[PDB]
Design a protein around this nucleic acid. Structure first.
Ligand SMILES: N[C@@H]1[C@H]2CN(c3nc4c(cc3F)c(=O)c(C(=O)O)cn4-c3ccc(F)cc3F)C[C@@H]12
Ligand SMILES: N[C@@H]1[C@H]2CN(c3nc4c(cc3F)c(=O)c(C(=O)O)cn4-c3ccc(F)cc3F)C[C@@H]12
Ligand SMILES: [Mg+2]
Ligand SMILES: [Mg+2]
Lengths: 485, 197, 472, 191
DNA sequence: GTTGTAT
DNA sequence: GATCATACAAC
DNA sequence: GATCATACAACG
DNA sequence: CGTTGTAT
C-alpha cells in the first residue's frame, strides 16, 4: 500500500474545491469587467491579435494562427473555445458592434457553424482598435501569464462603453449576467450627460438612451421594464419580431417577418411552426416559406382564405420564439467583486476608468517628451562644442573615461554623455542643429501642454468628451430596435 | 408557377439545403465538399432553385469497392436520396428531382480528386443522368465570402459552367478502368507517360 | 439556365483532373526528397519550429503554438495532419533518430494516441538542428508559400543522411516507397567510403553498413534480401522478435497490444495449445511480453509464423530526385546526398566569403577615415547636405558609396584611440579568412574533407549502438 | 494475478485479481489517461478516463443518472452494482483514487465525483476505499510523483457528521441556487 | 487489416 | 476532445 | 473535420 | 426537457 497517507474530511474538501471553481468562474471566465466590458478570453483574443499585428490596416491572418498564439501565450484552454469566442465577435447578429473582421464562412443566422480554422482568416475591426488605443503608453496594468513567461493586460483602455454597447452573458456559478446591446452614439451621449450633470436622474438619461438597440432590430414592448432595469440593474422586457401583413397575388393575407428577436434562430422557429401546424395546435396556415436573401430577412407565413392573419399572428407570438422576454440582470465585475449595477453605476464606472487612462497617457507622454528634450539639450551643447567634444573623446582611451570627462566638462548626465558618444558623424552637418532646435522647441510646448492637462482635471474630462465624440462620429449607427408602448 | 409550402415530410437527408421550387427543369443540386463550403453555398444560393448537398470527405471509389460496400456507404446513399432517381434496377431518369447537377469541389488538387471520385459514381451508377446532360462542373474564377461565391460561381448571369459530355463510351470505359481501376501498373504507366514535371 | 456555358469531355476532364492530383500527391505530399529525406509536412514543421525559435537550447512551446504557425505560414492543411506528423518525429519507436523533443503525452508503443495540442509542448531535437545547419547562409533555395506572403526552403541542408537513417514511407498514387532506418554511424561510414573509393561495390558498402537498424531492435533473418535491396533498390526481408516464453523486442511497426489481442483470439480458436497465459508485464523502462507439455518451441515457432511476431519488410527505395520519382539504389542515394552536401558547403563558403570581403571593404574605409578624422569632420561639418557630404568624401579619399555611408554613420565613441587598432585587428583577420575561404572554393579536395570532418562530428555526437542484430 | 483471455472499451485494467492491493485511478480525459497508463505498474493499478464533466447527481433526474455513460463506466469498473445490487463485498478495487487536474476545472470534477460517490456509492466511502491524488507530464513524471506507493501522498476521504455532509452537498451542489450564492458571498475573499 | 499524409 | 469513412500501394 | 454529454442560472 | 455561452 502507501506510506505517507493523509486524511481529508468530505465536507471540508468539497467546500474548498467548490469555492475554488466558484470564484474562478465568476471573476475569471463568466462575468465581464465593468470597465472594458470584456471577459478573459475576449480580452486575450483582442490583445493577442494586437501583438500579432492583425490591425485594420494590415491584412488578415489564418484563424488557426490567431488562436495558436492566444492559446499558447495567454488563454490556457482548448483551441475551439478560443476560435468560437472569436467567430462570435465577428458576426453582425451576435455583436452589436463587431470586434473582429473575418474572411470566409463565419456561420449564419440559421445556426450554421463557421468553417474550420484552416479556412477562415480574421483581424481586428476598425472599432476594436479603440479598445486598444494607447495600450503601450501605460494606461493599463499588466500581469504575468499562466506560464509566467508572457505579460498581459488586466484590462484594456476601451475608448467606448463596450459593456452597454455590446451587452454581456452570462452563465457562471451561483450567479448570471444578462445585458442587452445599445446604440453607440446613444451610449456615448449617456456618458457625456452623466459627466456634465452629476445630478442627472435615470429618466434624464433615458432621454438620450431610450433603451436596448439589438443588432437584428425587432420591437420592444413596454418601457416600464426598461426604466426598472436601469434603476435597479434588474428588469423584464418584451421583445417582438417586426412583422407586416401582405396581400398575395391571389387575394389572401400574407404574414411577413423581417426582424426576429435577439438570439432567435429563424430556422428554429420555422421548424417550430411546422411542428405546431402539423399538430393542429394552430390552424389557418397555408404555407411557411423562408424567402430571406443575402440582403434581407423574409420569413413568410401565408394564411388560407377565411382565416384571420392577426389571430394566427398573435398565436405565433404566444407559442413560438417569435416573441420572447429579455431578463435584465446587469451583473459585472467591479473592484474584483461581482456586483449588480444600475445604469448610472455602469456609466460612472466607465467614466472613472476613462479618466485614469487619459491621465496615465498624459503622464507617459510627458515623461517621454521631457526625457527626449533632456538628451536634445545634451546633443545641442555637444554640437556647439563639437571640437572640444571630439578632442576629449579622441584623447580618451576608454569610453568610461571619455564619458566621465564630457559629463564633468560640459556638466552632462550619464544619459546625455552616452547620447553624445553615440552621435553619427552625419549628425555633425550644418543643417543638423537647426533641426534639433526645432524639435527641442516643440518638446517645450508639448511638455507645457501636457503639464497643464495633468494640472487641470477640467481638461482631462474635456479630452475624454472630445475623444468620445470622435468615436461616435466614426462608428455610430442608426437605431435598429424600435421601442414602443 | 409551381413551388413548395413547407410542412411536408420529404424524408430527405439531414443535410441538403433543398430549394423552394419543385420543378426538375430549373432547380439545381450543388454537390459541395464539406460544410465549410456548404455553409458558404447554403447562405447565398437563391433558396428557390439551388440546393446545396455537402459531401464529407472522399467518396468511395466504386471501381475498387464491392457492391456490398456501395450499398452501405452513407454519403452515396444521401446522394441518390437527394436525386430521387433510384438505384440500378430502379434508376429512373424521368423522375430525378434535379435537371442540373453541378459538381462544385474545392479549387485545390484534392478537389480535383473528389471531382474524379464523383464522376466515376455518376458514370458507373448514374449513367442516364450524364447521358441526359445534367451533370455539370462549376468553373470558379472554395471557402470564399457569401457574396463572393454567388457573384462568381453561383449566379447564372455571370457564372461559367461546363457541360460534361461523353464522346466514345468505349474510350470512357477504358479511362475509368485505368485511372480508377484496381490495376496499379496501367495507372503508374499512365502517370509516367502523361505528366510534365 | 446559364448564359455562358461551355462543353467539357468526360475523358478529357478525368485525365486532366487525375494527373493534377497524382503529381501533386507524388512530388509534394507522400514521397520524400532524396536530398534531405523529408516530405513537405516534416520539412515545414522543422523550418516552422526553427523560425518560431524552439531550438534545443531554448524552452518548449505549446504544440498549438507550433501547429498554429506551421499551418498559417507554410502548410496549408489541417491541425491534426501536422500535429500527427510532429508526434511521429518525437517517438523513439517511430524514428530511429527523433527530430523533435516533446514534453507530455506523445503516445505509446501500445497504439495510444498523443494528447491534445493544448497539453503537449515541444521543440527541435539536438540532432534535428543538423538538418538546419547554415540554413541562413544561402545553403538552400527558397520559394514563396501557398499564400505568397511568406518564403520557405525547398530543401533543408541536412548535415546527416536523414533518408537512410530514419527511413521513408510511403503510400502515394500509382507508386509507394518503403525505406527502413539505419544506424547514424553506419550510414556516415558509407558516405565517406563512397567519397574515398567511388569504384566501390555493393558488397563493399555492406561492409560498413550491414543493413537496417530499426529503433525497436529485434532481428533480421537472412542477408540475401539486404543485398538485392541495396543493389536494385527493391527486395524483401524477414523481421523476427527478440524472445527468451518472454518477448523483449517486437519488429518494426508492430503493436504489442495488437499482437496480444491476436494471440488471445488464436488461443480461443484451438489454433494453438500450450497457451496457458499471455500477459504484458512491460514497464516504463523495460518491455516484457510473457506467453505443461507443449514444447513451446513448437508453439513459439507457430506464433511467429501465424501472428505478427515475425513480419516481412519489402524494400522499395523510392524518392524524388530532380523533380521526378525514381527507384534508387543504395549507391544512388549516397551519391544524391554527397552531391547535396557539396552544394551546401560550397554555398556556405561562398556566403562567408562574400560577407567577409564586404566587411573588409567597409573596414578599409573606416581606417582611411580614422586616419584623416580631422578633414573628414571638416568635410561633413562644412557639408551642405548628407548627399553632398558623401560626394565630397568619395571624391577626396576615393571611397565608394557604401564606404562613405559607413563613415557618415560612425558613432563619435568610435573615434577614440584604441578603436583604430581594434579595427585593424579585425581587418587583418579577415584577409586570412577571405584567403582561406578562397582556397576552399578553389580546391574541391577541401570541400570534400570539410564534409567528411563535419560528418564524423555528427557521428561522434549523435550516433548510437546498433539495435537490430542481423542473423542468417 | 489474472490470466487474461477473458472479456469497458477504455479503462486499462491491471494484472492482479486481488481487490485488496489493486487500485483504480479515475483521471480526467484520455490526454491524462495516456500518461498515467504509460507508467502505472500494470499489476495492482488500473486507470479509467472520465471523458468530460461528470453529471451532478444532486440535481439530475434518476432517469438521466441511470442513462449517463460515464457513470455506467465507473460502476461497471468497480463491479459493485447499483442501488439494490450494491455489493461492497464484490468491489474489484480497494483503492479508488480521484486524480483530477490541478486547475479549477479539475477541482470542479472532484466535487462532482465526490457527490456521485457520496450519493450512490456511500458504502464505498464509508469503508474508506476512496482516495484523492496529491499532485505537486511525462510517464516517469506521474509515476515518480503521484503513482508510486513507496512515495507519493494520498488523501483518504473520511466523513465525520453525515448530517453536515448531507447538508454540504445539498447547499453547494443542490438545486437551490440562492443558498449557494450566499455561501460564495460568505466564505470567499476576493480582494 | 495495417501502414501515413490527406479530405 | 474521441470517434467515426475514405483514397492510395503494397504484404 | 462533425457529432456527441455535461456544469452553471435563468426563463420557457 | 430545451436554450444561452465558456469551460471539461
Ligand atoms: N460522452 C461525451 C463525450 C465528450 N463530449 C464532448 N466533449 C467535448 C466537446 C464536445 C462534446 F460533445 C468539445 O466540443 C470540446 C472542445 O474542446 O471544443 C471538448 N470536449 C471534450 C471531450 C472530452 C473530454 F474529456 C473533455 C472535453 F471537454 C460529448 C461526449
Ligand atoms: N462519412 C465520413 C465523414 C468524414 N470522416 C472523417 N473526416 C475527417 C477526419 C476523420 C474522419 F473520420 C479527420 O481526421 C480530419 C482531420 O482534419 O484530421 C478531417 N476530416 C474531415 C471531416 C469532414 C470533411 F468534410 C473533410 C474532412 F477531411 C468520417 C465520416
Ligand atoms: Mg467544443
Ligand atoms: Mg485526422
Amino acid at each position: 500500500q502507501d506510506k505517507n497517507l493523509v486524511n481529508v474530511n468530505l465536507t471540508k474538501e468539497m467546500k474548498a474545491s467548490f469555492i475554488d471553481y466558484a470564484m474562478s468562474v465568476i471573476v475569471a471566465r463568466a462575468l465581464p469587467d465593468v470597465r472594458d466590458g470584456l471577459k478573459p478570453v475576449h480580452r486575450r483574443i483582442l490583445y493577442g491579435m494586437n501583438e500579432l499585428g492583425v490591425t485594420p490596416d494590415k491584412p488578415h491572418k489564418k484563424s488557426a494562427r490567431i488562436t495558436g498564439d492566444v492559446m499558447g501565450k495567454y488563454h490556457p484552454h482548448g483551441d475551439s473555445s478560443i476560435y468560437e469566442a472569436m467567430v462570435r465577435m465577428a458576426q453582425w447578429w451576435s455583436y452589436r458592434y463587431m470586434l473582429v473582421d473575418g474572411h470566409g464562412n463565419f456561420g449564419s443566422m440559421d445556426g450554421d457553424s463557421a468553417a474550420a480554422q484552416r479556412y477562415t482568416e480574421a483581424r481586428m475591426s476598425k472599432i476594436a482598435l479603440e479598445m486598444l488605443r494607447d495600450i503601450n503608453k501605460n494606461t493599463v496594468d499588466f500581469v504575468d501569464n499562466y506560464d509566467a513567461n508572457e505579460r498581459e493586460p488586466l484590462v484594456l483602455p476601451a475608448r467606448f462603453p463596450n459593456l452597454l454597447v455590446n451587452g454581456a452573458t452570462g452563465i457562471a456559478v451561483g450567479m448570471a449576467t444578462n445585458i442587452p446591446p445599445h446604440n453607440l452614439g446613444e451610449t456615448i451621449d449617456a456618458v457625456k450627460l452623466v459627466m456634465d450633470n452629476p445630478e442627472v436622474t435615470t429618466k434624464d438619461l433615458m432621454e438620450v438612451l431610450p433603451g436596448p438597440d439589438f443588432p437584428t432590430g425587432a420591437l420592444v414592448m413596454g418601457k416600464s421594464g426598461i426604466h426598472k432595469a436601469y434603476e435597479t440593474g434588474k428588469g423584464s422586457i418584451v421583445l417582438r419580431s417586426r412583422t407586416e401583413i401582405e396581400t398575395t397575388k391571389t387575394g389572401r393575407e400574407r404574414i411577413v417577418v423581417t426582424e426576429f428577436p435577439y438570439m432567435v434562430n429563424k430556422t428554429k422557429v420555422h421548424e417550430h411552426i411546422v411542428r405546431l401546424v402539423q399538430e393542429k395546435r394552430i390552424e389557418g396556415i397555408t404555407a411557411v416559406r423562408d424567402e430571406s436573401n443575402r440582403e434581407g430577412v423574409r420569413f413568410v407565413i401565408e394564411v388560407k382564405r377565411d382565416a384571420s392573419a392577426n389571430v394566427i399572428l398573435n398565436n405565433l407570438f404566444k407559442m413560438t420564439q417569435m416573441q420572447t422576454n429579455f431578463g435584465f440582470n446587469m451583473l459585472a465585475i467591479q473592484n474584483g467583486i461581482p456586483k449588480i449595477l444600475s445604469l448610472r453605476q455602469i456609466l460612472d464606472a466607465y467614466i472613472e476608468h476613462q479618466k485614469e487612462v487619459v491621465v496615465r497617457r498624459t503622464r507617459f507622454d510627458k515623461e517621454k517628451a521631457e526625457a527626449r528634450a533632456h538628451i536634445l539639450e545634451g546633443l545641442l551643447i555637444a554640437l556647439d562644442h563639437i571640437d572640444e567634444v571630439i578632442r576629449i573623446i579622441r584623447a580618451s582611451e576608454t569610453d568610461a573615461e571619455a564619458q566621465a570627462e564630457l559629463m564633468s566638462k560640459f556638466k552632462l548626465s550619464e544619459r546625455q554623455s552616452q547620447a553624445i558618444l553615440d552621435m553619427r558623424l552625419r549628425r555633425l552637418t550644418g543643417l543638423e542643429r537647426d533641426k534639433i532646435q526645432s524639435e527641442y522647441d516643440d518638446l517645450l510646448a508639448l511638455i507645457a501642454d501636457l503639464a497643464d492637462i495633468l494640472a487641470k482635471p477640467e481638461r482631462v474630462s474635456q479630452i475624454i468628451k472630445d475623444e468620445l465624440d470622435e468615436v461616435k462620429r466614426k462608428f455610430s449607427d442608426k437605431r435598429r430596435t424600435e421601442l414602443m408602448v | 408557377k409551381h413551388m413548395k409550402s413547407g410542412l411536408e415530410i420529404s424524408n430527405l437527408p439531414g443535410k441538403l439545403a433543398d430549394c423552394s421550387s419543385n420543378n426538375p427543369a430549373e432547380t439545381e443540386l450543388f454537390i459541395v465538399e464539406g460544410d465549410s463550403a456548404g455553409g458558404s453555398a447554403k447562405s447565398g444560393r437563391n433558396r428557390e432553385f439551388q440546393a446545396i448537398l455537402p459531401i464529407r470527405g472522399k467518396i468511395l471509389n466504386v471501381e475498387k469497392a464491392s457492391m456490398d460496400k456501395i450499398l452501405a456507404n452513407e454519403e452515396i446513399r444521401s446522394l441518390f436520396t437527394a436525386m430521387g432517381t433510384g438505384f440500378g434496377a430502379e434508376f429512373d431518369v424521368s423522375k430525378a428531382r434535379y435537371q442540373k447537377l453541378v459538381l462544385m469541389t474545392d479549387a485545390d488538387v484534392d478537389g480535383a480528386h473528389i471531382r474524379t471520385l464523383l464522376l466515376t459514381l455518376i458514370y458507373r451508377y448514374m449513367k442516364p443522368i450524364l447521358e441526359a446532360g445534367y451533370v455539370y462542373i462549376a468553373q470558379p474564377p472554395g471557402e470564399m465570402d457569401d457574396h463572393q461565391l454567388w457573384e462568381t460561381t453561383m449566379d447564372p448571369e455571370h457564372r461559367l459552367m461546363a457541360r460534361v459530355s461523353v464522346d466514345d463510351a468505349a474510350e470512357a470505359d477504358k479511362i475509368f478502368d485505368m485511372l480508377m481501376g484496381d490495376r496499379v501498373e496501367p495507372r503508374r504507366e499512365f502517370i509516367e507517360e502523361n505528366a510534365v514535371y
